[PDB]
Amino acid sequence: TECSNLLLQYGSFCTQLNRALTGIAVEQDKNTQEVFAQVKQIYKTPPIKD
Amino acid sequence: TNSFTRGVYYPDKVFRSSVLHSTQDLFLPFFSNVTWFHAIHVNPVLPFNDGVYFASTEKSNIIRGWIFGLDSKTQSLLIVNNATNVVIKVQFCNDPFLGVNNCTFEYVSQPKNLREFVFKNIDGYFKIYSKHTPINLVRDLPQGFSALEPLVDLPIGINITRFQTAYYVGYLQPRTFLLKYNENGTITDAVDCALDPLSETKCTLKSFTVEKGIYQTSNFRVQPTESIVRFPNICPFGEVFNATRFASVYAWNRKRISNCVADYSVLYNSASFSTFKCYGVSPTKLNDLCFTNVYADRGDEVRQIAPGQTGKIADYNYKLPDDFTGCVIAWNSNNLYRLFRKSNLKPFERDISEGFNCYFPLYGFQPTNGVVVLSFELLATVCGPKKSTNLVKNKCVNFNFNGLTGTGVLTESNKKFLPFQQFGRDIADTTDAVRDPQTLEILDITPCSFGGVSVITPGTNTSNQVAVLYQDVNCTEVPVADQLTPTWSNVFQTRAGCLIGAEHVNNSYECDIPIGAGICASYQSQSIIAYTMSLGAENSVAYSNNSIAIPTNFTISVTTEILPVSMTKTSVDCTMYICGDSTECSNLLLQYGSFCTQLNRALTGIAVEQDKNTQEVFAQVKQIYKTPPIKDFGGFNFSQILPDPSKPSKRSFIEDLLFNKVQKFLGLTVLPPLLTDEMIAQYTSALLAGTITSGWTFGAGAALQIPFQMQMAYRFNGIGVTQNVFWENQKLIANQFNSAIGKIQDSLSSDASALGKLQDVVNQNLQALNTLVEQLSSNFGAISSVLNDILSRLNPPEAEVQIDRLITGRLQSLQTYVTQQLIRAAEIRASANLAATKMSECVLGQSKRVDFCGKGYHLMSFPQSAPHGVVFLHVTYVPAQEKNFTTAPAICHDGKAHFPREGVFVSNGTHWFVTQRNFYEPQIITTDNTFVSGNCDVVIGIVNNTVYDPLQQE
Amino acid sequence: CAQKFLGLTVLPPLLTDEMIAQYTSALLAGTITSGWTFGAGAALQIPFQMQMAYRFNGIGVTQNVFWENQKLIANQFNSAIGKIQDSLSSDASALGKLQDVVNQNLQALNTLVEQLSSNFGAISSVLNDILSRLNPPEAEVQIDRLITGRLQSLQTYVTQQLIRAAEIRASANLAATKMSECVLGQSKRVDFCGK
Amino acid sequence: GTGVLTESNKKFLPFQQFGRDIADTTDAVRDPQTLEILDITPCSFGGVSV
Amino acid sequence: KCTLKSFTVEKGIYQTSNFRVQPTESIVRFPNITNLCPFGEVFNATRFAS
Amino acid sequence: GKLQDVVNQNLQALNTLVEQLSSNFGAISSVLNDILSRLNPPEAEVQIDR
């Protein structure tokens, strides 16, 4: 605890860090969704590949 | 004891208005249980704590005077709090209420209800806050806001309180919380932290209103509850540290004994023996810390303890390293030599082996004048005795392996500790495993569980319900170390997290509040619902070797794609950010290798770049096309997108709607855009006109001139729609376009959903500044966060240290800001070159890029300006009303395969015709509309039909 | 114990390998069913062989070039996919950039993790033991300097992770472009879709 | 500090001697010697572009 | 020229200096306490012993 | 200029590092040698750490 109270002396350090990291995390999901989850439909691969 | 009675008060805080501020001032959480009332009717009250809050009713005084305060012994106040001279006394007639060593410290005379004397504590003295007493609550507990501060601090010093006197008492906890100050700086309903996870989110985001989303709330840990300080325990040390023998100049021992159990140099802890100095350790942690050195080792100069000092220790006397750990004690009243040494000494060197004839010889026992250190190792132990509980399995404790303090569970000694049988390290940290000092057969490899907490918030404008997920969790159970309110409350046992849940749905739906891991949530009889994220809708259309779907009709859809172009570019002048109005630190500004100048240089670079981004995105012209005064272009009501009417100074209607959506002396400034919103609107005009009047305004030299219907004719022709509908469907294409603009005007301009992506930059930029300025309110280890206070409080030789500490902190934060912005500038540059590319190939021409310039087959895009960005209305062609026709590539009987020139040999079961992938619009095979190479070939797909040659002409 | 307790964890992707594979299935299925005729979701069904004829015609050869060579073309295709099945095996190129990205991040943490042990000018780095050894008053260096050091290491980590993210975002933007132009579309661009 | 003193446009509760801004820099001070509070604006400042 | 350490400066606008406004007065505001602080009762006390 | 600006910023980035060395960072002097010449034994660690 003592070091956490001392870390708080570096005011709101991690709030900024956590936000940046979270921003990266949503950006990653945004990238996946944007890259391949591009379809509003899921066409099912035909059972007969003729 | 419910209804969320708000334990709020102004915590001696400066008046602030229109703000949201967080603190930890021991407020009253809404946890009240029972209170002491209804004593009499038609039973003494003695509740006590330091962390208390009192509230009650009124008829006269009711409390027979409000009191606070043992009995007639010490520090007894029993303040009357009545009209007749309230005094701070420190027990006879006041024992009962009045009516039906008397040393005083202070005099104040400060003077159904809701009288509150709440929030008490000492702070070395006294603390008390008080609230108004409304008389129209028509209930027992008022929805209130806060208590005020008449005067709180007085010379009381009560270590404990138990005095009072239809009654209410609450008890305080040192919790963090959020206080909302309205425009009049009145604290409105506050939000406790750890009251509930939604409140945790509100604290987390330092914002009461919380949009629907997954917010990462504070982490969670199980509490270590016990500790081990175990060692076999029980040497001369405890007695021989003192020695009559005094020969230390030619002697500094280190190991009088290798193993001590009698180690308690209280001589230092209480200074029961003499003066001392400890290096690297507390003087009091003598049985908490242990070293493998138990003994060691005078002169008028104890100044020569000298861990790297410039004394006689350098060459004659005993030397210690600058990086020395240990503790030294001295002796006096006591009534070998420090002769000259030609060589220098090394740390911990013990050398007791040219100045004419004076180098070889080498004290005085008479009272010439009234004119000893133990080194500490870094390690196991064998000193500083201590004992505790036995090994604790399956629950987490502190002090794992005694000499170290860990929070791991003491289980599973599945490690051999082969060479030494004592200690293990992790792949990534000092401590991984231990062998218990007394029973060397058991281990600590399981640190008390810990992880992050994500919270699902449905959006506070709809619901106050939440779901919570421990990011890494067994999904077997959740401990109670925190809200502490719910049970562990059927919850989806997902790896994403599982503490308190949501209906775990066996059905599937569109994604919302995406927790991640293929799991989404919503509030849809309102409750949190957790779903397995579904995919897009199933498409089951059959395909065959001869089945082709061909549109018979079409629509024009307008995709509104909004891209950031520029940042809310700023310039931080560190002279103020760090040193505003501070002249003492002025020397420090110069101290740097222009680091500040370089940080500002980076932001200036960013700003110039931002102007360049706007310039590429909008300024690709030399002569601007003035929108012709027509409103006559195929009837397309471009009047809705062009800045023609001059109602606003320059803006178009769509851009008006875009601009209708979407902080002083901060030490920084937000530089004006080079091109104002008015100029951008005018460049927008320059592009839209020209775009609808000539075409390639840049690429084709103002694009000569086009009737506009010829233009979109050619654009259809570009997308692959040739000689099909651009002329046949005049008044239909125009109508669909028009309707699409209506679709944007009442949809995104009413929501700003798609439009909020612009703010992904603006919000972040503001947050970045908000972070930066908020970062100022930080001590960084300095005595105070306020530089001017350091200057007003500390002298030069002492202030500079803390000034520099604060400066270093602020410089680290500023570098962080510059860096964050340099990277965001790069990202926006990437979006800006995308936007410029899109303006160039979507607006200044017809891009063949599929699903790039909007959804579907882009034929056109009409840009509009947005604050720090561009919105492209990409008018795209979409096929519609598809019919499943039979296809084949070829026919014969003419001795010619006759493959379709550009079309498809398609039939409705008969009437084999040829058309394209644009519209049904069937046509007779028409030899001139086919391509022949191969005749009656072995090629797959001949349908044995015939085609008329227009030149048969018989 | 590859991933230990350092506060450094991984949040699962929204789109899990099942979800990614599932979307990929849709994408391929759309490719073999509408090819390019999509109103960004509004697929128009075409027979695959016919789609190939149209794509071939879109590249400057006639539809009959494909049809005359239907057997050739389809058979060359089958051989080519087999070639890739083998050429992507035997750890070829370590699957290129994908390995690199993961390597770019695991190391990002091995570095961050290593920094945990740095003393930052202090005697030690084991903060819990530092507090045990000395009292907070005597911790301007023992704790706060250490904290500052870790602060910088984390800030460096996020900074580099943001750069990594920016780079990744650009890669993803290009990948998305390919996803909508190269697949679910016919690129007319040289080396956009490979040589 | 340094700044422009002006009559505030808002009365503040008597319990505090001074107020603070969003940037946590002093917003206003009640005069210890007078029954008034004066907004304090940081003295005009900014960059110089040549 | 100094900001860029070059005697010849390219045509353009440069972020050169820092504009702050010089204060025109020194304003001292303290409560009008006329009671000399009884430090003598603290430091010239007859008995500190206890 | 496009291709000059890049080399420029790269070199400038180097130029900056050179300038940075000149900083004392709050130290008694700017060069390790001076530190090593003035307060070496007792405070080299402190000044050097700075």
Numbering used by the authors:
A (entry chain B): 747 to 796
B (entry chain A): 29 to 70, 81 to 107, 110 to 130, 134 to 143, 164 to 174, 187 to 240, 264 to 332, 336 to 398, ...
C (entry chain B): 851 to 1045
D (entry chain C): 548 to 597
E (entry chain C): 300 to 349
F (entry chain C): 946 to 995
What does the article say, verbatim?
To drive the fusion process, class I fusion proteins undergo an irreversible conformational change from a metastable prefusion state to an energetically more stable postfusion state. However, while both pre- and postfusion states are usually immunogenic, the labile prefusion state has been demonstrated to induce a more potent immune response in multiple viral families. To address these limitations, we developed a general computational approach where the protein’s sequence is optimized for the conformation of interest (here, the prefusion state) while destabilizing the other conformation in silico.
Notably, the spike designs enhanced the protein expression of their base construct (S-2P) by approximately 17-fold. Furthermore, the 3D classification performed on the spike cryo-EM images also confirmed the prefusion integrity, with particles displaying one receptor binding domain (RBD) in the up conformation. Solving the structure at a resolution of 3.7 Å revealed that the S2 subunit, the only part engineered, closely matched the computational model, with an RMSD of only 1.345 Å (377 Cα atoms). While most of the designed substitutions stabilized the prefusion state, the mutations N175R in R-1b, L130D in M-104, and T941D in Spk-M were additionally predicted to have a significant destabilizing effect in the postfusion conformation. In the postfusion conformation, these residues are situated within the hallmark six-helix bundle, where charged and unsatisfied polar amino acids are highly unfavored and can potentially disrupt the core. Given the requirement for a solved prefusion structure, our hMPV F and SARS-CoV-2 S designs were based on pre-stabilized constructs.
